[PDB]
Amino acid sequence: DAMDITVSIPPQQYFLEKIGGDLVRVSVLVPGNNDPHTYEPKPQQLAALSEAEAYVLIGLGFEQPWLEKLKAANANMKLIDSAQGITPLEMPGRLMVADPHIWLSPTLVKRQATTIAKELAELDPDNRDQYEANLAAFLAELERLNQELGQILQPLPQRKFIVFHPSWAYFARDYNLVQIPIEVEGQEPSAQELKQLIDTAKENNLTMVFGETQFSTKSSEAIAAEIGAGVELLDPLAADWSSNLKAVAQKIANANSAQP
C-alpha cells in the first residue's frame, strides 16, 4: 500500500509527489505559513511519526531544532538527508555555518530528488522503475524550469534585490543575482546597518523590497518607504513550487529591469 513518508516543508511534498506518485502518502511537519527556523512540532505530529517509514530531511542543519525528537519518535524511521553530496553556501551572517535553503535551486533540487528516488527504491524495490521514471520526467521538468528562469533574469540590468529573510542565496547564485537581507542571525550588532542598506538601495535605484510570507512585513514596509520602493512578497515555502519560482523570477525581473 502507499508508503508513509514525512517531510519538513511543503516544497519537499512537491518533490515527493513528483517522484512517488500514488506510491507515497506525504506528511509535512512545518505548515507553509510558519517560520521553520522557530517551529516546534506538535505532540500529535510526534505521535504520527510512528507510522512514517522514512523522513526526508532538508539537511544542512535545517532540522537540528527537532532532529532528536524525530529519532525519539521513531528510531526505525529512515532519515533521508536530501542535501548529501552537495557543496553548501555559507550563511549571510556568521561565515562558518551552512545555508540550508537549497530547495529553491532548480539545479540543486535535481540532486535532492535523485537522492529521494534512490532511497524510495530501496524501501520499495518492486516499484523501483516508477521511481526512476518519475525522477527522469521531473529532472527534465527541472532543466526546463531552470532554462525558463534563466531567460527572465539573465538580461536584467539590476542584479541586486532586497529581501527580508535570506532564503534565496542558492537561487540567486544559479542566476547570478545577489540578495541583500534585511534580517541577520549572528552578524554585526550595528543598529544602523539597515541605514547603510537604505542608502545603498537609493544609490542603486533599487525599486522593491521583497519580504517573505512567513514573516511580518513591518520592517520591510518601513525600509521600502524610506528607499521610495515598493513592497512585494515572495513565498519560499509555496507548495506550488515550480510555478512559484517562476512568479518570483518574474517579480524580480519587473523590479530589476529598466523602469517606467
Residues lying near Zn ion in the complex (CB under 5 A) = 167
Q: How far is the CB of 173 from Zn ion (least distance, A)?
A: 15
Closer CB to Zn ion, 20 or 166, in the complex? 166
Q: In degrees, to the nearest 5, what angle opens at C-alpha 168 toward C-alphas 159 and 89?
A: 100
Cα distances from 161 to residues 15, 82, 178, in angstroms, run 27, 28, 6
Q: How far is the CB of 166 from Zn ion (least distance, A)?
A: 7
Buried b (16+ CB within 10 A) or exposed e, 138-158: bbeebeebbeebeebbeebeb
Closer CB to Zn ion, 114 or 215, in the complex? 215
Closer CB to Zn ion, 4 or 99, in the complex? 99
| Cα atoms in the 13 Å half-sphere on the side-chain side of 260 | 1
Give the three cell numbers for residue 31.
505548515
Backbone angles phi, psi at 4, to 5 degrees: -90, 105
Q: How far is the CB of 168 from Zn ion (least distance, A)?
A: 9
65, exposed or middle or buried, with CB in 10 Å at 0-12, 13-18, 19+?
middle
Instruction: Report whether 165 belongs to an annotated binding site.
Output: yes
Q: How far is the CB of 153 from Zn ion (least distance, A)?
A: 21
Closer CB to Zn ion, 115 or 167, in the complex? 167
Parallel/antiparallel/unpaired status of strands 78-81 and 54-57: parallel
Q: How far is the CB of 76 from Zn ion (least distance, A)?
A: 29
Instruction: Report whether 37 belongs to an annotated binding site.
Output: yes
Cα distances from 195 to residues 158, 205, 223, 235, in angstroms, run 21, 15, 9, 26
Taking CB atoms, the residue at the shortest distance from Zn ion is: 167
Closer CB to Zn ion, 12 or 167, in the complex? 167
* Residues flagged as binding site for Zn(2+): 37, 101, 165
Residue positions forming the annotated binding site: 37, 101, 165
